[PDB]
Short mmCIF file of C-alpha atoms in Angstrom, two decimals:
data_model
loop_
_atom_site.label_atom_id
_atom_site.label_comp_id
_atom_site.label_asym_id
_atom_site.label_seq_id
_atom_site.Cartn_x
_atom_site.Cartn_y
_atom_site.Cartn_z
CA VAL A 246 94.24 127.18 104.36
CA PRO A 247 92.22 127.63 101.14
CA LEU A 248 93.31 130.20 98.54
CA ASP A 249 90.86 132.53 96.77
CA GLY A 250 90.23 130.82 93.44
CA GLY A 251 90.65 127.12 94.12
CA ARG A 252 94.21 126.51 95.31
CA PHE A 253 96.11 126.09 98.60
CA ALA A 254 98.38 128.44 100.55
CA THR A 255 99.75 125.70 102.82
CA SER A 256 102.97 125.70 104.85
CA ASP A 257 105.03 122.66 103.83
CA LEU A 258 104.86 121.33 107.40
CA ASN A 259 101.96 119.21 106.11
CA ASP A 260 103.76 118.31 102.85
CA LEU A 261 106.57 116.74 104.87
CA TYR A 262 104.65 114.85 107.53
CA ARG A 263 102.48 113.61 104.66
CA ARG A 264 105.74 112.37 103.18
CA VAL A 265 106.86 110.91 106.50
CA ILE A 266 103.61 108.94 106.45
CA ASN A 267 103.15 108.23 102.73
CA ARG A 268 106.52 106.50 102.84
CA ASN A 269 105.75 105.03 106.26
CA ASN A 270 102.53 103.25 105.30
CA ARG A 271 104.11 102.14 102.05
CA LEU A 272 106.89 100.61 104.17
CA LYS A 273 104.53 98.60 106.36
CA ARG A 274 102.76 97.56 103.16
CA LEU A 275 106.06 96.42 101.67
CA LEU A 276 106.52 94.18 104.70
CA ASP A 277 103.10 92.49 104.58
CA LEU A 278 104.04 91.89 100.95
CA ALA A 279 107.38 90.67 102.31
CA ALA A 280 109.59 92.19 99.60
CA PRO A 281 113.35 91.37 99.43
CA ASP A 282 115.85 93.00 101.83
CA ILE A 283 117.81 95.78 100.07
CA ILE A 284 114.53 97.06 98.55
CA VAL A 285 112.48 97.43 101.74
CA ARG A 286 115.67 98.59 103.42
CA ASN A 287 116.04 101.26 100.74
CA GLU A 288 112.55 102.14 102.00
CA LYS A 289 113.96 102.64 105.50
CA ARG A 290 116.50 104.93 103.83
CA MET A 291 113.56 107.03 102.68
CA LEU A 292 112.09 106.71 106.16
CA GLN A 293 115.16 108.20 107.83
CA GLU A 294 115.44 110.90 105.16
CA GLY B 845 88.52 140.57 87.79
CA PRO B 846 88.65 143.88 85.84
CA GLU B 847 88.73 146.58 88.54
CA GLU B 848 86.56 149.70 88.56
CA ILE B 849 87.11 152.86 90.61
CA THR B 850 84.50 153.06 93.40
CA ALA B 851 81.49 151.81 91.39
CA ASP B 852 80.07 149.32 93.94
CA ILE B 853 80.86 150.67 97.43
CA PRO B 854 79.49 148.70 100.45
CA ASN B 855 80.43 148.93 104.16
CA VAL B 856 79.41 152.60 104.28
CA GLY B 857 76.36 154.78 103.80
CA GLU B 858 76.15 158.09 101.96
CA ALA B 859 77.93 160.14 104.61
CA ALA B 860 81.27 159.02 103.21
CA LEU B 861 80.00 159.83 99.71
CA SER B 862 79.46 163.47 100.68
CA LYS B 863 83.00 164.04 99.41
CA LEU B 864 83.01 161.09 97.00
CA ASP B 865 81.24 162.57 93.95
CA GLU B 866 79.57 160.90 90.95
CA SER B 867 82.84 159.02 90.44
CA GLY B 868 83.34 157.81 94.00
CA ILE B 869 86.56 159.81 94.17
CA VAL B 870 87.57 162.33 96.86
CA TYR B 871 86.64 166.03 96.53
CA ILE B 872 88.63 168.95 95.08
CA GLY B 873 89.85 170.13 98.48
CA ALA B 874 88.50 167.97 101.29
CA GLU B 875 89.32 167.77 105.00
CA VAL B 876 90.02 164.03 105.25
CA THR B 877 90.95 162.78 108.72
CA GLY B 878 91.54 159.69 110.85
CA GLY B 879 90.33 156.79 108.76
CA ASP B 880 88.21 157.95 105.82
CA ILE B 881 88.58 156.78 102.21
CA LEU B 882 90.55 158.61 99.52
CA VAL B 883 89.48 156.78 96.35
CA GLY B 884 87.23 153.78 95.82
CA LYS B 885 88.88 150.55 94.69
CA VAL B 886 86.90 147.40 93.84
CA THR B 887 88.18 143.79 93.76
CA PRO B 888 86.48 140.35 93.20
CA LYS B 889 86.35 137.50 95.78
CA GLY B 890 86.36 133.66 95.84
CA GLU B 891 85.13 130.20 94.78
CA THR B 892 86.15 128.13 97.85
CA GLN B 893 84.56 130.59 100.28
CA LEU B 894 81.02 130.82 98.81
#
């Protein structure tokens, strides 16, 4: 929801699923790029977190 | 926004102002009941909503 003035009074539910997906799309990107193991796997670390 | 007491008072007519003098403040011995207004308080609104 918008805040009077020009800001946002949002419940972090969004700011976590956004994270679940920012990281998620970046992960699929990192695989089309075919980056080395431990790096894209460190990405799956961030996916499970 | 710098607040002013009463000044601009919408959502009512002049019936409520029968006890809200030339200052928009309640009388010197009124019979306020139910849901009337004691003193007028003004506050600004918002960018995103206009």
